[PDB]
Amino acid sequence: LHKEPATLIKAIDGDTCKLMYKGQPMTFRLLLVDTPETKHPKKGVEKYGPEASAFTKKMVENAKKIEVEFDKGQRTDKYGRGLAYIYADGKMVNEALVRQGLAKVAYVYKPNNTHEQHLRKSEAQAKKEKLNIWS
Numbered sequence: 001l002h003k004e005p006a007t008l009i010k011a012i013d014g015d016t017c018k019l020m021y022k023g024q025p026m027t028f029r030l031l032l033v034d035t036p037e038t039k040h041p042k043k044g045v046e047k048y049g050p051e052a053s054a055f056t057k058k059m060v061e062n063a064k065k066i067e068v069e070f071d072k073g074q075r076t077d078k079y080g081r082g083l084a085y086i087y088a089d090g091k092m093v094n095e096a097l098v099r100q101g102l103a104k105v106a107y108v109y110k111p112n113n114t115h116e117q118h119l120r121k122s123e124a125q126a127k128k129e130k131l132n133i134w135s
């Protein structure tokens with residue numbers, strides 16, 4: 001995979017944000033994970049949703065550098081959101097969230113699953129430690 005620079009425009013929630021990519025604003029959705037919902041009425045504000053948003057927001061807003069890394073399959077979903085692993089100063093937001101128990105490994109669609117095992121080992125550690133979602 002290859003990392004590419006991006007510029008934070010606006011953090012929306014734990015797993016969705018707007019970034020300037022290739023001189024074009026677009027919303028991105030984190031690959032392989034799912035932070036709780038805070039916008040959709042069908043799900044309501046799920047437990048830990050706000051916590052996940054705050055964690056992500058702090059992480060991306062305080063970064064000197066943001067990079068996006070597409071996987072080997074499709075680069076956008078049906079809603080036109082970019083699908084990537086996002087790094088804030090070299091730290092993967094997707095993993096950071098899972099490690100804290102603020103996200104679950106979800107939507108594993110191949111061939112977009114290069115980092116699946118890494119994220120799963122982190123989720124296991126969070127459950128093991130009974131963190132947030134796993135408390």
Ligand SMILES: Cc1cn([C@H]2C[C@H](OP(=O)(O)O)[C@@H](COP(=O)(O)O)O2)c(=O)[nH]c1=O
Binds near residue numbers: 032033034106
């Ligand atoms: C992470 C991801 C989400 N999605 C879709 C699945 C869900 O569609 P439906 O909305 O039709 O259920 C939605 C979940 O994202 P949200 O957590 O933003 O809702 O986005 C993909 O298509 N591919 C992906 O890799």
Ligand SMILES: [Ca+2]
Binds near residue numbers: 034
């Ligand atoms: Ca979500």
